[PDB]
Symmetry: C2
Subunit: 80 residues, 2 copies
């Protein structure tokens, strides 16, 4: 019932932001969420620049996923 640890979990949270609108935005969702995590990582315990940096470098994968999916050009089949 925890469902976490998995990186895809962090991104799956972004999908709801763009998909729905509980309390965020579209592309500007990552910026908010991304900044939210960054603060936690830095606030965590900055035990090692790597520990915090590693999470930052990896977290970039999420930010890119949103942009790469929110990019101007898109291709699929829509839904209605």
């Amino acid at each position: 019932m925890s469902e976490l640890f998995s990186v895809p979990y962090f991104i799956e949270n972004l999908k709801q932001h763009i998909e729905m609108n509980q309390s965020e935005d579209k592309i500007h969702a990552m910026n908010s969420y991304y900044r939210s995590v960054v603060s936690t990582l830095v606030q965590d315990q900055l035990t090692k620049n790597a520990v915090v940096l590693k999470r930052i470098q990896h977290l970039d994968e999420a930010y890119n996923k949103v942009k790469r999916g929110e990019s101007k050009l898109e291709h699929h089949h829509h839904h209605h």
Copy 2:
């Protein structure tokens, strides 16, 4: 040799973004110029995660300076 050594120089660039329109925006000026610098500080040379971390943490002073210069300009939701 002696050039761009001063950190305040980086901020002075932001003032132009908000003041003028060198192909940027207002507050979002820092975000764009922010992700640009940190991105370079990480690509320039990874001599040490800390060497870049300390520089990044310092840059925070710049971004904060831009906002700090504002006045919650973003549709006040009527809140103390």
